[PDB]
Amino acid sequence: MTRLPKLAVFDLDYTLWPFWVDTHVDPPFHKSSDGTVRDRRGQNIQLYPEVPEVLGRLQSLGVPVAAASRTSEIQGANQLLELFDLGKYFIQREIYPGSKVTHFERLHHKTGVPFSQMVFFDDENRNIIDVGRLGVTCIHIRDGMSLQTLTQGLETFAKAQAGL
Ligand SMILES: [Mg+2]
Structure with a gap:
């Protein structure tokens, strides 16, 4: 296993x-005629390249996905998820200021999933420190999310759950 x-x-x-x-950026955002996502200052807003597949892959592996952000730009963060057609990949979104221990406690209550899982x-x-105290396996990333980072991350979780 x-x-x-x-x-x-x-x-x-x-x-x-x-x-x-x-x-x-300067919210709100909107899709341009050329299909791009833009903000009030005409900036081209883009996700890390492989993000759509990272989330789709988790969905394929049967792993539920949630968002946990401390941003004060709540409506702006939410709108980007919608515009980038990522809404379908999340079951819960905790987007509001505060230590992420709060975001995770609420996720635990809403999903029933133990922190250890x-x-x-x-x-x-x-954030890795605060949330790690709950037993959550925390993957400290660099250069954003990518399929490789996802793989290594799941590997790390599997190894932790195997006594490593
Ligand atoms: Mg961050």
């Missing part, structure tokens, strides 16, 4: 997209 997590949780800024939604991807060590 290779233990698959019962819930995968993703940070947003520098995890699914290369910027801070409360700093580098969750895998979490985030680029900030402070």
